[PDB]
Curated annotation (Swiss-Prot):
Glycosylation-annotated residues: 10, 49, 135, 160, 197, 223, 231, 274, 279, 311, 315-316, 321, 349, 376, 411, 437, 442, 492, 523, 532, 534, 543, 571
Function: Binds water, Ca(2+), Na(+), K(+), fatty acids, hormones, bilirubin and drugs. Its main function is the regulation of the colloidal osmotic pressure of blood. Major zinc transporter in plasma, typically binds about 80% of all plasma zinc. Major calcium and magnesium transporter in plasma, binds approximately 45% of circulating calcium and magnesium in plasma. Potentially has more than two calcium-binding sites and might additionally bind calcium in a non-specific manner.
Binding locations of Cu cation: H1
Outcome of mutating R112G: In Yanomama-2
Source organism per UniProt: Homo sapiens (Human)
Assembly: Interacts with FCGRT; this interaction regulates ALB homeostasis. Interacts with TASOR. In plasma, occurs in a covalently-linked complex with chromophore-bound alpha-1-microglobulin with molar ratio 1:2 and 1:1; this interaction does not prevent fatty acid binding to ALB.
GO CC terms: blood microparticle; cytoplasm; endoplasmic reticulum; endoplasmic reticulum lumen; extracellular exosome; extracellular region; extracellular space; Golgi apparatus
Site-annotated residues for Not glycated: 2, 18, 39, 62, 71, 91, 104, 134, 157, 172, 179, 188, 193, 203, 210, 238, 260, 272, 284, 357, 370, 387, 400, 412, 430, 434, 464, 473, 498, 517, 522, 536, 539, 555, 558, 562, 572
Disease connection: Hyperthyroxinemia, familial dysalbuminemic: A disorder characterized by abnormally elevated levels of total serum thyroxine (T4) in euthyroid patients. It is due to abnormal serum albumin that binds T4 with enhanced affinity. Analbuminemia: A rare autosomal recessive disorder manifested by the presence of a very low amount of circulating serum albumin. Affected individuals manifest mild edema, hypotension, fatigue, and, occasionally, lower body lipodystrophy (mainly in adult females). The most common biochemical finding is hyperlipidemia, with a significant increase in the total and LDL cholesterol concentrations, but normal concentrations of HDL cholesterol and triglycerides.
Gene Ontology biological process terms in this record: cellular response to calcium ion starvation; cellular response to starvation; negative regulation of mitochondrial depolarization
Protein name from the UniProt record: Albumin
Keyword rRNA-binding attributed: no
PROSITE patterns: ALBUMIN_1, ALBUMIN_2
Length: 582
């Protein structure tokens, strides 16, 4: 504690400092123009530099929280633009700040950000590279005010990389386009988990959050001691609570600290984190969070000894139920990095359930006797699902695989909107290609991580617009029974098919000139609709119809007076098909 700004400036750097101040000021005053924030950042940076000169310079003593709210309140148009928020400026510190993140908007009503043309971008990049990146940083900052600043800055650097490299290439687009698409989805996946992790905290509460982190932290640091895991799981949870609240500074410091701790006691935690601990302040935590699993020691005993044989399991259990279970988790976790965290939690719950319905019996040691036996089924189910689905993703391929899903889920919840079913089965197919790549050792974990966001993205929609009681059932269940529930959904026999169309099954020659992406969506949408008119159709009946329409498409997108092909030939298809599906 010598001088807030000065210190942050000092071990952050003018470049990173200037970028973070912008992001922070943009996540609050999300309605102010660019040219307006650029002045603040310059005013603030001119300040931090004044302080660097003389730590005793006026106001260099103030707290970042105080100095910040002070700047925010100097926005003369704060009342006219933000109104209610301008009311915050009348309060003292602690409640001024609070007042501010209270009025932080989660869903700014701003125009979707459109991706310009590679050549326009690259030329903007070439002419004024800083204002080009700052403007876009500012644009994504205000659209996601709850996105952890430092992480947002991390993506920016990846953007400047892709541009720098591609803008000086041959098929600039061939280069640039796939990068931006990868970045987009990554940034979106990152933001979905940030929001998802905070929501799980809200509903399910600290305990389940704690049980999740023990299994996950102890899978990564198999060499750490349960007391060290707990220390971390404790500090970790405090970090998420803090960060979820939205206070960047408080959240930053909390992450900075936990990172210092882990790096100092790194040998006591893991070996695979050397590099991360040599990195600059800004990337220490980010690095560590993404660190790879350490190798689990080679003298690892058999659980059944301490948790299923040895009497007193009930004595050690009742003495401190959670610490014991937490021990079971830590133990089972580090021995299984090939399991999804949920699967582990699924086993601890089963263990817990048993200990409870057994320690309360004359002979307990013989009650919870065959317990590890009940674990078996629980492990096989997610394994089989991954096998058959990756097996299928092989003989089919991404697109044709996505169709198999489309057909499969459309029959389960026919009530679900079509543009929604498509979106979901599309992202689901992607998970198959992104995970079916790695040995079976890193598959389940992979799948769990992707499915989690996808399943949540789906439930969020179903919220604002309930359509099925079933989807809502799984969506409201424990973040642990969520997936198995969906997996359990059965073909909707109750469903009453919509009336046949022709308009829905009409195709004009534009598909021949559409982007594969748009061509697939078109074909896929029709497929969903097709299954909704005959959800009792076979994989046989359906394949045929699907082939005939494929040939037909190519067989008209290679003709002439071809608007006629679609119409003339299409009438024969929709007609012959109607008959096949009865
Ligand atoms: C959190 C962001 C804190 C920025 C520091 C602002 C300093 C303003 C001083 C005049
Ligand atoms: C600083 C961040 C630079 C981002 C510039 C690229 C624009 C991204 C538009 C989102 C999209 O890819 O559709
Ligand atoms: C003027 C405001 C300075 C910005 C404060 C945020 C500092 C972020 C430090 C990185 C913390 C972390 O490791 O996550
Ligand atoms: C395996 C978890 C990585 C260890 C946490 C240290 C980094 C703090 C960020 C918390 C986000 C999870
Ligand atoms: C701090 C460790 C606590 C261990 C609790 C064992 C049960 C884990 C499952 C939590 C999720 C749930 O109850 O559905
Ligand atoms: C993508 C293809 C679908 C595979 C589903 C795998 C199930 C995920 C296992 C996670 C869990 O145990 O809940
Ligand atoms: C949008 C409605 C579709 C709902 C299905 C969600 C898919 C869950 C994936 C679980 C894998 C499986 O068992 O099929
Ligand atoms: C009668 C209309 C039938 C519409 C079925 C849609 C077929 C799409 C299958 C995708 C493909 O084969 O490229």
């Amino acid at each position: 504690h010598k001088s807030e700004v000065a210190h942050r400036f000092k071990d952050l750097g003018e470049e990173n400092f200037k970028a973070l101040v912008l992001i922070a000021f943009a996540q609050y005053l999300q309605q102010c123009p660019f040219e307006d924030h650029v002045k603040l950042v310059n005013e603030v940076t001119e300040f931090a530099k004044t302080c660097v000169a003389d730590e005793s310079a006026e106001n260099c003593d103030k707290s970042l929280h105080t100095l910040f709210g002070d700047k925010l309140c100097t926005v003369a148009t704060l009342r006219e633009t933000y109104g209610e928020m301008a009311d915050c400026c009348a309060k003292q510190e602690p409640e001024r700040n609070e007042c501010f993140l209270q009025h932080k908007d989660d869903n700014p009503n701003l125009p979707r950000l459109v991706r310009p043309e590679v050549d326009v971008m690259c030329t903007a990049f070439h002419d004024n590279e800083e204002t080009f990146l700052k403007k876009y940083l500012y644009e994504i900052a205000r659209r996601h005010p709850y996105f952890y600043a430092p992480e947002l800055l991390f993506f920016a650097k990846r953007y400047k990389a892709a541009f720098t490299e591609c803008c000086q290439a041959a098929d600039k687009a061939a280069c640039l386009l796939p990068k931006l698409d990868e970045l987009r989805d990554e940034g979106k996946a990152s933001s979905a988990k940030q929001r998802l992790k905070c929501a799980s905290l809200q509903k399910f509460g600290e305990r389940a959050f704690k049980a999740w982190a023990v299994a996950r932290l102890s899978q990564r640091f198999p060499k750490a001691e349960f007391a060290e895991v707990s220390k971390l799981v404790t500090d970790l949870t405090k970090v998420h609570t803090e960060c979820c609240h939205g206070d960047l500074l408080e959240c930053a410091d909390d992450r900075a600290d936990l990172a210092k701790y882990i790096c100092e006691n790194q040998d006591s935690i893991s070996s695979k984190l050397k590099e991360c601990c040599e990195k600059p302040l800004l990337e220490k935590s980010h690095c560590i969070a993404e660190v790879e699993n350490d190798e689990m020691p080679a003298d690892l005993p058999s659980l059944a000894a301490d948790f299923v044989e040895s009497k007193d399991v009930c004595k050690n259990y009742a003495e401190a139920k959670d610490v014991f279970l937490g021990m079971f988790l830590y133990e089972y976790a580090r021995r299984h990095p090939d399991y999804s965290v949920v699967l582990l939690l699924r086993l601890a719950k089963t263990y817990e359930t048993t200990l409870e319905k057994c320690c309360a019996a004359a002979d307990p040691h013989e009650c919870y006797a065959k317990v590890f036996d009940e674990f078996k089924p629980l492990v096989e189910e997610p394994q089989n699902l991954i096998k058959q689905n990756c097996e299928l993703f092989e003989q089919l391929g991404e697109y044709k695989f996505q169709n198999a899903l489309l057909v499969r889920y459309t029959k389960k919840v026919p009530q679900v909107s079509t543009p929604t079913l498509v979106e979901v089965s599309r992202n689901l197919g992607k998970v198959g290609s992104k995970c079916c790549k790695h040995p079976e050792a890193k598959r389940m974990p992979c799948a769990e991580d992707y499915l989690s966001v996808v399943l949540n993205q789906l439930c969020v929609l179903h919220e604002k617009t309930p359509v099925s009681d079933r989807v809502t059932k799984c969506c409201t269940e424990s973040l642990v029974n969520r997936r198995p529930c969906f997996s359990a959904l059965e073909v909707d026999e109750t469903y009453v098919p919509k009336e046949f169309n022709a308009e829905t099954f009409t195709f004009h020659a534009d598909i021949c000139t559409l982007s594969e992406k748009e061509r697939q969506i078109k074909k896929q949408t029709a497929l969903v609709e097709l299954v909704k008119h005959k959800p009792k159709a076979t994989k046989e009946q359906l394949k045929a119809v699907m082939d005939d329409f494929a040939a037909f498409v190519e067989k008209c997108c290679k003709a002439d007076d071809k608007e006629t092909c679609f119409a003339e030939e299409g009438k024969k298809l929709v007609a012959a098909s109607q008959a096949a599906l009865g």
